[PDB]
Design a protein around this nucleic acid. Structure first.
Ligand SMILES: [Mg+2]
Ligand SMILES: [Mg+2]
Ligand SMILES: [Mg+2]
Ligand SMILES: [Mg+2]
Ligand SMILES: [Mg+2]
Ligand SMILES: [Mg+2]
Ligand SMILES: [Mg+2]
Ligand SMILES: [Mg+2]
Ligand SMILES: [Mg+2]
Ligand SMILES: [Mg+2]
Ligand SMILES: [Mg+2]
Ligand SMILES: [Mg+2]
Ligand SMILES: [Mg+2]
Ligand SMILES: [Mg+2]
Ligand SMILES: [Mg+2]
Ligand SMILES: [Mg+2]
Lengths: 6, 88, 129
RNA sequence: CUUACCACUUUGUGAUUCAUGACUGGGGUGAAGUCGUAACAAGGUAACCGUAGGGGAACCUGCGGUUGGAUCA
RNA sequence: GUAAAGCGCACGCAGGCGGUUUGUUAAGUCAGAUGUGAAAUCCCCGGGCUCAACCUGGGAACUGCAUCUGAUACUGGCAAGCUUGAGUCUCGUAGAGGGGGGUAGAAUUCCAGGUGUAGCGGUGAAAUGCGUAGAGAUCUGGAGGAAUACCGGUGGCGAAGGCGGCCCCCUGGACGAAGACUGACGCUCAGGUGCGAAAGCGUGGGGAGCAAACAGGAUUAGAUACCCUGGUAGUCCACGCCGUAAACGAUGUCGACUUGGAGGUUGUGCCCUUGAGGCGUGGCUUCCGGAGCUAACGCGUUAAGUCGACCGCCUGGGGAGUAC
RNA sequence: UAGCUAGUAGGUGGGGUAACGGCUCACCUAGGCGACGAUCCCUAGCUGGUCUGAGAGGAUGACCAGCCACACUGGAACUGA
């Protein structure tokens, strides 16, 4: 919650 | 709590004899006297909550007896309250 | 405080039986006896005994068998908190029959079999099996 | 014709309820983000509870209370 | 009890519940009878459509309601009792139980002076800090606040929160011993009222020690901390307020029944009190363990066993004990 | 949602209806309702029955039959058994 997007 | 002679008087004033120490009216007065007496103790002191508890117990008790007696002999009831100057 | 002697009687039995007590005593009463009567008459106890003058004292002698007691189980049905009455058709049958249900009727404290036959019902006091 | 009753409607002021509202509070959900590592072992300052003060952040510190603390203290 | 769940603790109106005997009542309760409970539907057995669906005759059912007549065990109402629940009285016992007023001895800190001389303090090690303007140490004197070493306990008292120097005054409860007296006056309790650690809030006092905040020295990559040197609110007193805590036994109150062992403490009966003592009979309080209960851990006559009365509470984790 | 109530609760006498009645009106009483939930909010036709369920229950009120209410919205009467 929340690396490349997501 | 209450003076041996003083209690002893009240016994032979509301009872059908001395030794009639457990009569309903008697029991009421012994409390009423004590109640009325502690009135001055809690006149000063005030913060004495543990003791005041005893007082309330005496009032409560006294209240459960009178109601018992109203329920048996009203005549005795009506008289006992006038005779101790209370109940209103 | 103490608010049901009949219930206590039954548990007194139940704990006595459990404890392998030879007998059990208790403060007596008219109704307490009627139950002992049905219990003896139907063979759950050896017999009653009321040794008292001012303060009746109901005594019950327990039954045992193989290695286990006779009263397998006994439970208060009708309660002071919740009264249970049933009609004639509707009277219960404990253990599919091989066990009783004590009922009070306007012709007295009898077996469920008894009341059924007598064509009447009433407050059902307790099961015993 | 006139009186009573009375529907529409009118005036003032409240109440409630639905919808909505710049902005704003936290909540929830979203494989690898940043900062630290508070908890779990004695988690490396035993932990936690009520309360108070303070601090980017977990949290820190004070007062009392709990064992739901490990150890020959 | 630990999974969600016993109100922090009581008092107590309404409500629910209520010991024991007789009489009386017949409301509850049970029995019978008579009315009604539309037809349809469901069910049973038949009959009709080629079968089935469907249609249909009769029955059972409609577990209900009302009324009349009986029954009287139980429940209730009323009468009158009873003494075992409950309470009153007499005499005693133990106790940081409460409120108020005194007072004492240790120690810390500060103030004044004497002696004295180069360090003290602190840490893992250091430094900030204090000392040659004489500190630390040491002696005499004085001011002042707070708390009560030993006793001390596996202790005691209190409804709970809680209560420890000593003394008096006012005062609550408990327990025991005998009886006498009252005669069910009882148990539980929504709502209600009251009490309620510590922190916190108001006003006014008080301020030694301690110490949130804060400052300085350290530590560390950083250190808004842990550690060190300092240090204010607070901790203290009065009066009012707050009403919450892992307010815990995470275990509601009351009553009854159900094998044992070992402690603590406080009563009381009996044995040439023979002197360490001995056996009984209560109260309160711990440890261990049987049945039984429990998911297990464990609880186990102070039950989490066997029962009854009333209350409060729980219904997936989170959102949230938050919002309105 | 904890209070509710002026024809309000009762009475007397007049009037009124097919009929009993605060139904209406004048006067007198001061009552009446509510913690067995009045009041005020929200939702809703009721029943026989229907669906499910071992049952007790839970869910439901189309179609058939009984009862009630409504007829564009608010209101009123006239005709008439
Ligand atoms: Mg850690
Ligand atoms: Mg730690
Ligand atoms: Mg839990
Ligand atoms: Mg508690
Ligand atoms: Mg029918
Ligand atoms: Mg009777
Ligand atoms: Mg203050
Ligand atoms: Mg709480
Ligand atoms: Mg044990
Ligand atoms: Mg809130
Ligand atoms: Mg009239
Ligand atoms: Mg008339
Ligand atoms: Mg509608
Ligand atoms: Mg069900
Ligand atoms: Mg219209
Ligand atoms: Mg006409």
């Amino acid at each position: 919650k929340a690396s490349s997007x997501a | 709590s209450l003076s041996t002679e003083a209690t002893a008087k009240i016994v032979s004033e509301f009872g059908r004899d001395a030794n009639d120490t457990g009569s309903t009216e008697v029991q009421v007065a012994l409390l009423t006297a004590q109640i009325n007496h502690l009135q001055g103790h809690f006149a000063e002191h005030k913060k004495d909550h543990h003791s005041r508890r005893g007082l309330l117990r005496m009032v409560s008790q006294r209240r459960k007896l009178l109601d018992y007696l109203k329920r048996k002999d009203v005549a005795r009831y009506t008289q006992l309250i006038e005779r101790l100057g209370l109940r209103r | 405080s103490m608010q049901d002697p009949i219930a206590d009687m039954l548990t007194r039995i139940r704990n006595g039986q459990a404890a392998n007590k030879a007998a059990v005593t208790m403060p007596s009463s008219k109704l307490k006896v009627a139950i002992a009567n049905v219990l003896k008459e139907e063979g759950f106890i050896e017999d009653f005994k009321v040794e008292g003058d001012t303060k009746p004292e109901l005594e019950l002698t327990l039954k045992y068998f193989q290695g286990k007691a006779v009263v397998e189980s006994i439970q208060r049905v009708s309660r002071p908190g919740l009264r249970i009455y049933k009609r004639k058709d509707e009277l219960p049958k404990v253990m599919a029959g091989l066990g009783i249900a004590v009922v009070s009727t306007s012709k007295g404290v009898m077996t469920d079999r008894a009341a059924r036959q007598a064509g009447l019902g009433g407050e059902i006091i307790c099961y015993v099996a």
